[PDB]
Amino acid sequence: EDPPACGSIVPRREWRALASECRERLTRPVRYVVVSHTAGSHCDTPASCAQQAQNVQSYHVRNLGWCDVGYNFLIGEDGLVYEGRGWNIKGAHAGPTWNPISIGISFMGNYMNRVPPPRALRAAQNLLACGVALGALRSNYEVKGHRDVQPTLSPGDRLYEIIQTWSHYRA
Amino acid sequence: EDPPACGSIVPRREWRALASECRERLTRPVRYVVVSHTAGSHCDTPASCAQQAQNVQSYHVRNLGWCDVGYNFLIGEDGLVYEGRGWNIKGAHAGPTWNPISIGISFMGNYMNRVPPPRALRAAQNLLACGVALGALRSNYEVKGHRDVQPTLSPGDRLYEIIQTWSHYRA
Amino acid sequence: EDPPACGSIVPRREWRALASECRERLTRPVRYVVVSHTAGSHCDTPASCAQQAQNVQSYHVRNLGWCDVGYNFLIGEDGLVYEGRGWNIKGAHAGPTWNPISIGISFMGNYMNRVPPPRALRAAQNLLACGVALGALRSNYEVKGHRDVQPTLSPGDRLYEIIQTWSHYRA
Amino acid sequence: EDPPACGSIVPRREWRALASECRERLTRPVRYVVVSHTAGSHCDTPASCAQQAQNVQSYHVRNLGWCDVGYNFLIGEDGLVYEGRGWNIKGAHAGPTWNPISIGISFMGNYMNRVPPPRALRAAQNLLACGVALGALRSNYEVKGHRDVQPTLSPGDRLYEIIQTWSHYRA
């Protein structure tokens, strides 16, 4: 358990992630959930997606210098949700104006002309569900697309195309 | 009326199962969950396990002439749960004295001397978790080994050896 | 084979018992008998008792959500023995360590400051005789006080005094 | 700011308990608390209760054969909490289904027709506030009546009426 029914999340110890060092904490009942993409390479197997998460964190830790991978959760097309900063550590993912008031979830890969498979979309929503259930996400949580809050191309034309569908998407 | 953060399941319409011919139902809160293996080939990709599902369902349908895949849910080493007969229909999985009062989930593989991967064990636990939230299983469901309800090595020595540690395993 | 009759037990059928869902079994011969009371309200007629018998059961299956009334037999001031889980299925009456190895007869009522009418005593002391002849009980079974194996006042204070008198009472 | 600030519990070695013999560990945060009552004699002086506490202990330890006073914490009408088997050791107080996912606090006495003094009602609540501040009790724990999970009158018809009023009582 991770208390309630938390839609199968892969713990850090499992994708061989480097120890975090982030100390800033999210004031908890979070309201917004910004959705993005990594614009990087994608993976369709648990093995390649654990090697892929690794690739993203190392770039964030070793190269850019941050305390840990900046997303709170990474979603692979292997239908699995990878753990990042978790439901409590404020993540660096949408800018200073949004990082402390929202959870950040990123779909691994670049979705300009490519749509993520149903299992990712499913894994994603299922991850939000265990969010409310946990008491980290207000049942009245609002999902904004990365574009919506920053001058950016992500989460890809196609991936942004679908998030507009979600019962919680917002203007 | 009552859905608390269930979990994510791969729909038959995705692993392309055949049409179910079963029309017999399980009476709702179900009290027992029987765990078993298929003593078949494992698979560690959403792709491969979309076939292993079929292999199992067709063997059951085409060769034993059953109305559908035997178990209510199949579980892959890929870390995803495959929908079998689901929470509503009675599956054929552990003798006539046990089939009408239990949910039968089965890890796809011959776990005689092979422990299933963490993500798989995680998949199953979470599945039963959804079970409760959804309301199909009692809050006090009782996970029982296959070999506990009838004469077989199933669900494999090492897999059985592992489920006895589960919070809901019983006598 | 020796018309072993002592059968004069009201059968589940007769007191309108809800169908049991219990399936684990004792092993005959069974060596111990734990005597408890229900600390509940007493009845003294085949009518008012098949009433209480139904009540004690709804409390065990409807409230505590158990697979059936927890005792193996219920004695009534009406002088009759009411079938509970019976001689073969293991009840839920004295805890993890005794439940597996013992039958649990319980007197319907609260014997903290009353002595069960002779009918009840005769009824029970006779019920044991049955267990013996049929084989359910070791010819030399040992009787225990509910409070003997669990922190409680059961089987009542004066009723407790009385059983310590029985031939088969053990330490 | 926010330091331990736990209320105060009488240590084991102050009321003289025998050495504990238990090794089974609770897994914390624990989310359920089951409120029981010894159903025995009350006390109202740090002297009489410290005595009463060991009575209860010998009974569970030498009589029943158990490894230590069944409960995790005993509440005295003297306004003081007596350390039972503590915050992290599995107790024997509500059968095999709850003993491992709950903490067991018992009010020394019998409240079937006697309301516990306010001090008592404040010592037990203060203890709970403590258990949350120490991360022993999940922040959103639920209080259950001993009788809501097992067949018994415990904690007492009036004490039971008292706790249902509680902000965490959730049957």
XYZ file of C-alpha atoms in Angstrom:
684
model
C 0.000 0.000 0.000
C 0.578 3.715 -0.515
C -2.627 3.906 1.629
C -5.728 3.837 -0.633
C -5.994 2.066 -4.018
C -3.084 3.749 -5.797
C -3.164 2.586 -9.398
C 0.126 0.670 -9.473
C 3.016 3.200 -9.392
C 6.641 2.148 -9.936
C 8.734 3.248 -6.936
C 12.100 5.006 -7.436
C 14.043 2.044 -6.091
C 12.587 0.205 -9.082
C 13.762 2.338 -12.015
C 17.204 2.636 -10.414
C 16.775 6.365 -9.733
C 19.385 8.612 -8.114
C 18.511 9.764 -4.595
C 16.539 12.986 -4.469
C 17.667 16.022 -2.528
C 14.590 18.195 -2.893
C 13.374 19.678 0.373
C 10.517 22.022 -0.652
C 7.046 20.619 0.157
C 3.671 21.041 -1.608
C 0.908 22.654 0.586
C -1.531 19.746 0.376
C -4.750 19.569 -0.788
C -3.381 20.371 -4.324
C -5.715 21.898 -6.893
C -4.171 21.949 -10.350
C -2.640 19.118 -12.325
C -0.546 20.398 -15.204
C 0.040 17.864 -17.969
C 3.093 17.893 -20.227
C 5.417 15.652 -22.232
C 9.209 15.209 -22.219
C 9.661 15.763 -25.948
C 12.193 12.976 -25.610
C 12.402 9.363 -26.768
C 9.505 7.058 -25.848
C 9.372 3.418 -24.749
C 6.755 0.699 -25.042
C 8.118 -1.851 -22.531
C 8.647 -1.716 -18.747
C 12.348 -2.345 -19.360
C 12.878 0.489 -21.835
C 10.684 2.869 -19.833
C 12.679 2.330 -16.660
C 15.824 3.060 -18.664
C 14.029 6.058 -20.130
C 12.977 7.556 -16.806
C 16.574 7.157 -15.727
C 17.656 9.125 -18.775
C 15.350 12.021 -17.875
C 16.345 12.274 -14.224
C 20.068 12.161 -14.971
C 19.650 15.084 -17.372
C 17.818 16.989 -14.662
C 20.223 16.078 -11.877
C 23.676 15.832 -13.410
C 23.307 18.369 -16.256
C 20.783 21.047 -15.271
C 21.739 20.695 -11.618
C 18.292 20.364 -9.972
C 17.650 18.298 -6.827
C 15.748 15.597 -8.749
C 13.704 14.895 -11.870
C 11.303 17.838 -12.006
C 8.096 15.995 -12.773
C 6.004 14.560 -9.962
C 5.160 11.533 -12.101
C 6.319 10.248 -15.507
C 3.896 8.176 -17.640
C 5.251 5.584 -20.033
C 3.517 4.002 -23.023
C 4.168 0.688 -21.311
C 0.954 1.499 -19.475
C 2.851 2.151 -16.236
C 3.186 5.283 -14.092
C 6.751 6.092 -12.940
C 7.374 7.865 -9.627
C 9.169 11.199 -9.663
C 8.968 13.775 -6.852
C 5.886 11.991 -5.506
C 2.681 13.559 -4.181
C 4.460 15.801 -1.716
C 7.709 17.280 -3.038
C 7.031 20.457 -5.033
C 8.234 19.706 -8.519
C 9.973 21.976 -11.010
C 7.811 21.455 -14.086
C 5.599 24.382 -15.032
C 7.354 27.509 -13.805
C 7.535 29.505 -10.499
C 3.908 30.566 -10.855
C 2.646 26.973 -10.894
C 5.113 24.577 -9.289
C 3.924 25.007 -5.661
C 0.190 24.714 -6.314
C 0.008 21.726 -8.670
C 1.143 18.202 -9.425
C 3.036 17.696 -12.647
C 2.576 14.620 -14.812
C 4.559 14.079 -17.998
C 4.051 11.613 -20.835
C 7.436 10.285 -21.925
C 8.004 11.005 -25.597
C 7.179 13.870 -27.965
C 3.514 13.893 -28.987
C 3.351 16.544 -31.712
C 2.357 13.989 -34.359
C 1.801 10.844 -32.292
C -0.905 10.027 -29.797
C -0.159 8.120 -26.587
C -1.793 4.635 -26.418
C -4.992 4.085 -24.380
C -3.006 2.353 -21.635
C -1.045 5.511 -20.940
C -4.149 7.702 -20.939
C -5.777 5.120 -18.711
C -2.724 4.806 -16.432
C -2.717 8.611 -16.193
C -6.318 9.082 -15.123
C -6.065 6.071 -12.809
C -3.068 7.899 -11.234
C -5.207 10.979 -10.638
C -7.935 8.829 -9.091
C -5.563 7.454 -6.483
C -4.610 11.092 -6.052
C -7.932 12.267 -4.634
C -8.260 9.016 -2.701
C -4.928 9.780 -1.085
C -5.847 13.289 0.068
C -3.244 14.978 -2.127
C -5.718 16.060 -4.792
C -8.973 17.877 -4.087
C -11.874 15.885 -5.546
C -12.530 19.183 -7.306
C -9.073 19.143 -8.988
C -8.476 21.068 -12.215
C -6.359 19.809 -15.137
C -4.595 22.430 -17.275
C -2.426 21.618 -20.279
C 1.227 22.684 -20.018
C 0.570 25.104 -22.912
C -2.259 26.679 -20.984
C 0.162 27.998 -18.366
C 3.520 28.596 -20.051
C 4.818 29.694 -23.429
C 5.381 26.147 -24.613
C 4.767 23.628 -27.357
C 4.232 20.582 -25.066
C 2.403 18.328 -24.290
C 2.279 17.937 -28.054
C -0.534 18.788 -30.463
C -2.001 15.277 -30.319
C -1.659 14.794 -26.539
C -3.119 18.236 -25.860
C -5.853 17.260 -28.308
C -7.084 14.550 -25.909
C -6.640 16.233 -22.495
C -9.263 18.758 -23.623
C -11.669 15.839 -23.391
C -11.116 14.989 -19.712
C -13.946 15.764 -17.333
C -11.604 17.994 -15.374
C -9.843 19.919 -18.149
C -10.157 23.661 -17.821
C -10.149 26.995 -19.606
C -23.042 4.971 -6.923
C -19.701 4.135 -5.085
C -16.271 4.212 -7.119
C -13.128 5.180 -4.944
C -9.981 5.282 -7.173
C -10.344 1.689 -8.453
C -7.388 0.783 -10.672
C -6.478 0.274 -14.345
C -7.466 -2.825 -16.347
C -6.781 -3.722 -19.995
C -10.233 -4.226 -21.628
C -10.936 -7.336 -23.724
C -11.662 -5.051 -26.616
C -7.926 -4.213 -26.490
C -6.273 -7.633 -26.173
C -8.955 -8.541 -28.671
C -10.701 -11.316 -26.808
C -13.505 -13.222 -28.484
C -17.121 -12.461 -27.504
C -18.137 -13.872 -24.119
C -20.966 -16.383 -24.220
C -21.389 -16.518 -20.431
C -24.657 -15.237 -18.975
C -24.420 -16.680 -15.438
C -23.681 -14.163 -12.675
C -21.799 -14.080 -9.345
C -23.892 -12.742 -6.435
C -22.294 -9.473 -5.473
C -20.174 -8.951 -2.650
C -17.850 -11.857 -3.385
C -15.922 -13.125 -0.378
C -13.094 -15.242 -1.726
C -10.366 -14.687 -4.265
C -8.526 -17.730 -5.588
C -5.003 -17.183 -6.938
C -3.518 -19.427 -9.615
C -1.030 -19.523 -12.466
C -1.516 -20.781 -16.008
C 1.648 -22.885 -16.103
C 2.221 -21.311 -19.487
C 4.592 -18.893 -21.190
C 5.197 -15.609 -19.460
C 5.403 -12.298 -21.313
C 6.936 -8.982 -20.333
C 5.502 -6.563 -22.907
C 2.032 -5.054 -23.284
C 2.286 -6.533 -26.768
C 3.249 -10.083 -25.902
C 0.825 -10.303 -22.968
C -1.962 -9.223 -25.296
C -1.320 -12.522 -27.047
C -0.743 -14.705 -23.981
C -4.194 -13.579 -22.952
C -5.649 -14.743 -26.266
C -3.712 -18.027 -26.199
C -5.318 -18.760 -22.848
C -8.820 -17.576 -23.752
C -8.931 -19.485 -27.036
C -7.605 -22.677 -25.488
C -10.452 -22.407 -22.991
C -13.063 -21.530 -25.612
C -12.062 -23.453 -28.727
C -10.716 -26.638 -27.059
C -12.580 -27.069 -23.754
C -15.686 -25.413 -25.130
C -16.136 -22.999 -22.194
C -18.159 -19.784 -22.617
C -15.071 -17.632 -22.067
C -11.581 -17.483 -20.571
C -11.640 -19.388 -17.283
C -10.357 -16.741 -14.874
C -12.033 -13.368 -14.131
C -8.764 -11.438 -14.529
C -5.356 -12.456 -15.906
C -2.214 -10.760 -14.605
C 0.906 -10.065 -16.606
C 4.586 -9.719 -15.776
C 4.307 -6.587 -17.876
C 2.701 -5.018 -14.840
C -0.851 -4.791 -16.301
C -4.111 -6.568 -15.442
C -5.962 -8.307 -18.283
C -9.758 -8.459 -18.044
C -11.178 -11.976 -18.172
C -14.754 -12.513 -16.997
C -14.522 -9.519 -14.667
C -16.337 -8.842 -11.381
C -19.814 -9.829 -12.581
C -19.767 -13.162 -14.460
C -18.997 -16.488 -12.801
C -15.728 -17.884 -14.060
C -14.755 -21.552 -14.343
C -11.579 -21.810 -12.310
C -11.661 -23.926 -9.151
C -14.284 -26.664 -9.053
C -18.112 -26.350 -8.684
C -17.948 -25.957 -4.912
C -15.767 -22.815 -5.247
C -16.590 -21.159 -8.592
C -19.909 -19.579 -7.481
C -18.474 -17.772 -4.477
C -15.051 -16.531 -5.543
C -13.214 -14.237 -7.945
C -10.451 -16.091 -9.791
C -7.383 -14.072 -10.842
C -4.413 -15.861 -12.427
C -0.791 -14.807 -13.052
C 0.161 -15.755 -16.625
C 3.143 -18.052 -16.200
C 4.409 -21.241 -14.563
C 5.671 -19.886 -11.259
C 6.972 -23.246 -10.034
C 10.478 -21.803 -9.618
C 10.177 -18.233 -10.863
C 8.920 -15.398 -8.692
C 6.639 -12.981 -10.510
C 8.064 -9.428 -10.879
C 7.193 -6.775 -8.283
C 5.107 -4.785 -10.792
C 2.994 -7.912 -11.294
C 2.418 -8.556 -7.611
C 1.678 -4.851 -7.387
C -0.794 -5.181 -10.258
C -2.768 -7.902 -8.501
C -2.879 -6.353 -5.055
C -4.106 -3.069 -6.503
C -6.668 -5.005 -8.569
C -8.279 -6.511 -5.478
C -7.987 -3.025 -3.984
C -10.160 -1.731 -6.822
C -12.306 -4.766 -6.117
C -13.263 -3.416 -2.742
C -13.633 0.230 -3.780
C -15.835 -0.873 -6.681
C -17.806 -2.966 -4.212
C -17.468 -6.413 -5.755
C -15.271 -7.874 -3.001
C -16.002 -7.580 0.706
C -13.772 -5.259 2.690
C -12.739 -8.491 4.360
C -12.257 -10.616 1.237
C -10.169 -13.745 1.757
C -7.335 -14.499 -0.672
C -6.886 -18.247 -0.933
C -4.342 -20.295 -2.857
C -5.556 -22.470 -5.753
C -3.925 -25.522 -4.173
C -5.942 -24.683 -1.068
C -9.319 -25.253 -2.778
C -8.298 -28.222 -4.918
C -5.456 -30.732 -5.830
C -2.853 -28.867 -7.901
C 0.618 -27.322 -7.550
C -0.928 -24.041 -8.724
C -0.290 -21.152 -8.341
C 3.302 -22.356 -8.180
C 5.464 -23.024 -5.127
C 7.207 -19.661 -5.074
C 4.073 -17.669 -5.912
C 2.080 -19.468 -3.216
C 5.054 -19.083 -0.891
C 4.618 -15.315 -1.536
C 0.845 -14.850 -1.193
C 0.774 -16.337 2.306
C 2.322 -13.075 3.453
C -0.577 -11.049 2.027
C -2.739 -9.186 4.559
C -5.880 -11.056 3.460
C -4.561 -14.629 3.044
C -6.583 -17.016 5.185
C -5.987 -20.526 6.566
C -24.259 -48.596 12.173
C -25.518 -48.520 15.784
C -28.288 -45.951 15.094
C -26.258 -43.341 16.705
C -29.272 -40.869 17.416
C -28.978 -37.771 19.763
C -30.177 -35.877 16.844
C -32.826 -33.674 18.358
C -31.017 -30.578 17.146
C -33.138 -27.913 15.470
C -31.618 -27.769 12.005
C -30.618 -24.480 10.332
C -33.651 -25.141 8.094
C -36.077 -25.050 11.016
C -35.017 -21.727 12.572
C -34.876 -19.882 9.264
C -31.085 -19.565 9.192
C -29.468 -17.437 6.484
C -27.348 -19.595 4.180
C -23.757 -19.998 5.325
C -20.768 -19.084 3.177
C -18.228 -20.752 5.456
C -16.123 -23.510 3.927
C -13.079 -24.372 6.086
C -13.428 -27.445 8.233
C -12.571 -28.835 11.622
C -11.102 -32.331 11.609
C -12.927 -35.162 13.364
C -12.153 -36.265 15.959
C -12.110 -32.810 17.553
C -10.445 -32.626 20.971
C -11.849 -29.561 22.779
C -15.163 -27.915 23.595
C -15.211 -24.199 24.468
C -18.377 -23.090 26.283
C -19.462 -19.506 25.755
C -22.636 -17.510 26.269
C -23.999 -14.710 24.145
C -24.237 -12.165 26.952
C -27.458 -11.564 25.051
C -31.151 -11.832 25.891
C -32.517 -15.278 26.680
C -35.509 -17.105 25.162
C -37.523 -20.002 26.626
C -39.741 -21.359 23.831
C -39.070 -23.017 20.466
C -40.686 -19.878 19.036
C -38.819 -17.125 20.827
C -35.528 -19.023 20.456
C -35.624 -19.667 16.703
C -36.073 -15.914 16.933
C -32.962 -15.163 18.918
C -31.062 -17.811 16.991
C -31.845 -15.819 13.877
C -30.843 -12.642 15.673
C -27.445 -13.781 16.958
C -26.753 -14.773 13.315
C -27.756 -11.479 11.679
C -25.391 -9.763 14.115
C -22.539 -11.998 12.993
C -23.197 -11.939 9.259
C -24.942 -8.607 8.711
C -22.957 -6.417 11.106
C -19.591 -8.025 11.645
C -19.962 -9.413 8.130
C -18.942 -12.967 9.061
C -19.618 -16.023 6.838
C -22.269 -17.228 9.347
C -23.033 -17.277 13.057
C -19.677 -17.964 14.702
C -20.668 -20.816 17.042
C -21.090 -24.501 16.226
C -24.226 -24.872 18.314
C -26.522 -22.653 20.355
C -28.292 -23.896 23.462
C -31.667 -22.465 24.383
C -33.476 -22.135 27.688
C -36.255 -23.734 25.692
C -34.273 -26.919 26.221
C -33.266 -27.390 22.598
C -29.955 -27.446 20.742
C -29.798 -25.166 17.686
C -27.557 -26.037 14.773
C -24.887 -23.417 14.143
C -21.999 -24.182 11.842
C -22.355 -27.764 12.985
C -19.825 -30.512 13.655
C -17.756 -30.168 10.471
C -17.231 -26.521 9.559
C -14.859 -24.536 11.804
C -16.546 -21.663 13.575
C -15.430 -18.217 14.754
C -15.841 -18.328 18.531
C -12.581 -18.487 20.513
C -9.721 -17.022 18.482
C -7.051 -18.157 15.954
C -5.515 -20.806 18.180
C -8.644 -22.719 19.297
C -11.052 -22.090 16.417
C -9.105 -24.625 14.268
C -9.175 -27.287 16.943
C -12.577 -27.140 18.668
C -16.356 -26.897 18.595
C -18.001 -23.935 20.250
C -21.398 -24.349 21.859
C -22.919 -21.148 23.265
C -25.840 -20.627 25.633
C -28.181 -17.953 24.368
C -28.507 -15.468 27.216
C -26.431 -13.559 29.780
C -25.361 -15.789 32.662
C -23.506 -13.247 34.763
C -26.241 -13.462 37.413
C -28.457 -16.414 36.448
C -28.034 -20.168 36.122
C -29.335 -21.717 32.917
C -32.510 -23.729 33.513
C -31.814 -27.502 33.850
C -33.251 -27.976 30.332
C -30.311 -26.044 28.889
C -27.712 -27.955 30.880
C -29.197 -31.345 30.099
C -29.482 -30.206 26.496
C -25.773 -29.374 26.250
C -24.335 -32.234 28.331
C -26.359 -34.404 25.972
C -25.139 -32.623 22.812
C -21.596 -33.577 23.771
C -22.644 -37.208 24.140
C -23.661 -36.941 20.487
C -20.375 -35.535 19.296
C -18.788 -38.549 20.940
C -20.959 -41.230 19.383
C -20.828 -39.712 15.915
C -17.095 -39.154 16.108
C -17.050 -35.384 15.998
C -15.569 -35.246 19.502
C -12.720 -37.319 20.941
C -14.341 -39.790 23.329
C -12.352 -37.881 25.927
C -12.766 -34.286 24.742
C -11.906 -31.491 27.205
C -14.293 -28.668 28.115
C -13.118 -25.085 28.462
C -14.529 -21.768 29.588
C -14.694 -19.055 26.965
C -12.876 -16.798 29.463
C -10.382 -19.655 29.871
C -8.918 -18.926 26.420
C -9.866 -15.279 25.885
C -10.198 -12.026 27.822
C -13.929 -12.010 28.597
C -16.653 -12.723 31.164
C -18.220 -15.338 28.896
C -19.633 -17.894 29.431
C -21.243 -15.906 32.234
C -20.313 -16.027 35.909
C -22.617 -18.659 37.396
C -22.671 -20.654 34.151
C -18.886 -20.611 34.349
C -18.982 -21.939 37.916
C -21.180 -24.821 36.740
C -18.972 -26.013 33.857
C -15.901 -26.152 36.089
C -17.978 -28.924 37.696
C -18.312 -31.007 34.554
C -16.289 -34.176 34.238
C -14.506 -33.070 31.067
C -13.483 -29.603 32.313
C -9.696 -29.246 32.064
C -7.363 -26.783 33.821
C 6.085 25.634 16.289
C 5.291 21.928 16.127
C 7.370 19.585 18.309
C 6.326 16.107 19.618
C 3.927 17.671 22.142
C 2.582 14.219 23.012
C 0.446 14.031 26.121
C 1.765 11.698 28.785
C 1.686 7.964 29.231
C 2.702 5.975 32.287
C 5.718 3.934 31.170
C 5.586 0.136 31.536
C 8.343 0.032 34.148
C 6.401 2.454 36.333
C 3.344 0.265 36.852
C 5.583 -2.815 37.001
C 4.424 -4.856 33.981
C 6.248 -8.167 33.456
C 8.628 -8.223 30.469
C 6.773 -8.258 27.152
C 7.311 -11.390 25.079
C 5.938 -10.206 21.758
C 7.939 -9.581 18.592
C 5.185 -8.979 15.987
C 5.469 -5.447 14.663
C 2.620 -3.147 13.676
C 3.185 -1.273 10.453
C 2.780 2.517 10.861
C 0.856 4.715 10.176
C -1.906 2.531 11.582
C -5.333 3.736 10.491
C -7.813 2.065 12.825
C -8.328 2.302 16.575
C -10.673 -0.124 18.353
C -12.050 1.171 21.659
C -12.578 -1.561 24.223
C -13.263 -1.769 27.957
C -11.881 -4.350 30.356
C -15.446 -4.890 31.589
C -13.802 -5.340 34.985
C -13.128 -3.178 38.056
C -12.389 0.534 37.726
C -9.844 2.685 39.629
C -9.279 6.371 40.405
C -5.794 6.938 41.847
C -2.403 6.597 40.136
C -1.944 3.845 42.745
C -5.077 1.753 42.311
C -4.936 1.929 38.495
C -1.219 1.143 38.320
C -2.254 -1.918 40.285
C -5.355 -2.633 38.207
C -3.189 -2.472 35.105
C -0.976 -5.344 36.271
C -4.020 -7.399 37.283
C -5.185 -7.280 33.669
C -1.656 -8.141 32.590
C -1.121 -11.257 34.679
C -4.511 -12.500 33.507
C -3.560 -12.149 29.844
C 0.032 -13.315 30.404
C -0.003 -16.190 32.911
C -3.636 -17.265 32.664
C -4.217 -17.088 28.898
C -0.549 -17.661 28.143
C -0.157 -14.502 26.040
C 3.075 -12.493 25.516
C 1.980 -9.206 27.153
C -1.073 -7.223 28.130
C -3.345 -7.646 25.164
C -4.043 -3.944 24.618
C -1.714 -1.290 23.211
C -2.868 1.271 25.775
C -5.034 1.157 28.920
C -6.944 4.283 30.023
C -7.491 4.946 33.700
C -10.304 6.830 35.372
C -7.437 8.501 37.191
C -6.906 10.554 34.047
C -3.779 8.727 32.912
C -2.912 6.501 29.947
C -1.053 3.298 30.844
C 1.305 1.985 28.190
C -0.048 -1.335 26.985
C 2.112 -2.946 24.353
C 2.568 0.413 22.651
C 2.383 2.209 19.315
C 4.286 -0.335 17.182
C 3.621 -3.846 18.512
C 0.661 -5.949 17.330
C -1.846 -6.469 20.130
C -4.425 -9.174 20.858
C -7.703 -7.274 21.119
C -10.003 -7.654 18.098
C -9.327 -11.009 16.442
C -6.979 -11.796 13.486
C -8.570 -9.323 11.034
C -8.040 -6.137 13.088
C -5.188 -6.874 15.493
C -2.647 -6.202 12.682
C -4.182 -3.031 11.212
C -5.235 -1.187 14.363
C -4.179 0.036 17.794
C -6.057 -1.264 20.837
C -6.975 1.118 23.654
C -9.083 -0.167 26.552
C -10.834 1.798 29.340
C -10.132 0.018 32.639
C -13.544 -0.710 34.065
C -17.071 -1.505 32.923
C -19.273 1.086 31.285
C -22.467 -0.797 30.529
C -24.193 1.656 32.865
C -21.403 3.969 34.024
C -20.017 6.922 32.046
C -16.223 7.341 32.200
C -15.116 10.523 33.998
C -14.148 13.461 31.752
C -10.436 13.010 32.533
C -10.722 9.544 30.995
C -12.453 10.844 27.890
C -9.646 13.408 27.654
C -6.765 11.005 28.305
C -7.823 8.738 25.487
C -8.374 11.568 23.023
C -5.114 13.212 24.062
C -3.428 9.889 23.370
C -4.891 9.880 19.859
C -3.693 13.397 19.159
C -0.312 12.143 20.269
C -0.442 9.099 17.953
C -1.120 11.354 14.985
C 1.611 13.835 15.886
C 4.069 10.902 16.072
C 3.009 9.535 12.711
C 1.882 6.339 14.410
C -1.743 6.881 13.464
C -2.625 7.819 9.903
C -3.891 11.392 10.055
C -7.363 10.298 8.944
C -7.698 7.313 11.298
C -11.103 5.868 12.154
C -12.294 4.845 15.600
C -14.325 1.660 15.827
C -16.244 0.255 18.747
C -14.893 -3.076 19.942
C -18.418 -4.432 19.181
C -18.476 -3.032 15.664
C -15.844 -5.590 14.687
C -16.394 -8.511 17.042
C -19.307 -10.031 18.983
C -19.226 -8.504 22.467
C -20.795 -5.712 24.528
C -17.413 -4.031 24.904
C -16.739 -1.171 25.296
C -20.079 -0.756 27.023
C -23.428 0.611 25.956
C -22.695 4.044 27.377
C -19.035 4.378 26.435
C -20.060 3.202 22.999
C -22.625 6.004 22.865
C -19.806 8.393 23.821
C -17.353 7.506 21.015
C -19.913 7.507 18.186
C -19.962 11.235 18.872
C -16.227 11.395 17.987
C -14.909 13.169 14.885
C -13.135 9.950 13.845
C -15.778 7.374 14.747
C -16.686 5.731 11.445
C -18.708 2.518 11.541
